[PDB]
């Protein structure tokens, strides 16, 4: 019985026929070969196909175990610590650039206003080349989404207002090739507080709603309203152990005097997804060292 699956990358869509004994790895490997991606360890096959949960597919398990064409999103799952130092291929860099830009523009990654303008200008340099008073004049940037909706909502400028501010930065990017404009975009984005972080809805022992963030450097607890500023930070080197059992997850600090952090997930599968990102990020962190 053939199963229809769609995989989308940030600038491609692929439709596949797979059998019930096709592995996640066979799907992943044919995606990466089609697009010519070598730096595979950053990436994964995403799917909101739990009974409602955002998840990452397992490569050494048959696709035919967890399911909501079957829809998959080929996306970066782990983020480098330093984008300029670590991303080797232009394709890898482009795929991060597009994924990160979508997170910013969709309001998912908070962005200050002047940063949004500057980022938008690099995106403009990447999509349009050098600004030319001849080629790009009045309204060259209408029809273009360049600033997050929450930035515009909180501010008092019109669309032409915004294009104008972006246009004055575009011109300073004369001589910048596209690939380099995409990296400069990432150099700025990777300084944003929400960049590169996987957020999970958790509760402490008192029943307060919190966020857990897992990122390349460790674990963070946020109050429900402040996803930018970690309330509690757990860098890998400050963790004695991490554990879960069903819905209960515990972080034990290296400081024998300091107390455990205990929180609760809504289901077992959430805690499993948290720990796999924990393991994946810790291992990449150790591999860099």
């Amino acid at each position: 019985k053939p199963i229809n699956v769609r995989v989308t990358t940030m600038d491609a869509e692929l439709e596949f026929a797979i059998q019930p004994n096709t592995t996640g790895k066979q799907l992943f490997d044919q995606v990466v070969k089609t697009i010519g991606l070598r730096e595979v360890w950053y990436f994964g096959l995403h799917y909101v196909d739990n009974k409602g949960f955002p998840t990452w597919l397992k490569l050494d398990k048959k696709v035919s175990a967890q399911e909501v064409p079957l829809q998959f999103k080929f996306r970066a799952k782990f983020y480098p610590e330093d984008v300029a130092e670590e991303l080797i291929q232009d394709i890898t860099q482009k795929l991060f650039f597009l994924q990160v830009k979508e997170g910013i523009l969709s309001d998912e990654i908070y962005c200050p206003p002047e940063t949004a303008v500057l980022l938008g200008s690099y995106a403009v340099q990447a999509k349009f080349g050098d600004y030319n008073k001849e080629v790009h004049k009045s309204g060259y940037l209408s029809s273009e989404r360049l600033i997050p909706q929450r930035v515009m909502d909180q501010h008092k400028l019109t669309r032409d207002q915004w294009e104008d501010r972006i246009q004055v930065w575009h011109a300073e990017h004369r001589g910048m090739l596209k690939d380099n404009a995409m990296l400069e975009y990432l150099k700025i984005a990777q300084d944003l507080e929400m960049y590169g972080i996987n957020y999970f809805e958790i509760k402490n022992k008192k029943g307060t709603d919190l966020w857990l963030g897992v990122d390349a450097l460790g674990l963070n607890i946020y109050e429900k309203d402040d996803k930018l500023t970690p309330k509690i930070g757990f860098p890998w080197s400050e963790i004695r152990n991490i554990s879960f059992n069903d819905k209960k997850f515990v972080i034990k600090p290296i400081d024998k005097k300091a107390p455990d952090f205990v929180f609760y997930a809504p289901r077992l599968r959430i805690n499993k997804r948290i720990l796999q990102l924990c393991m994946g990020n810790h291992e990449l962190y150790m591999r860099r060292r």
């Binding site: 596949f16 096709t22 592995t23 066979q26």
Partner: peptide
């Protein structure tokens, strides 16, 4: 035998 079979592709340039 279990290897996926590509039936469709869309590539966005811009």
């Amino acid at each position: 035998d279990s290897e996926p079979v590509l039936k469709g592709v869309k590539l966005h340039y811009t």
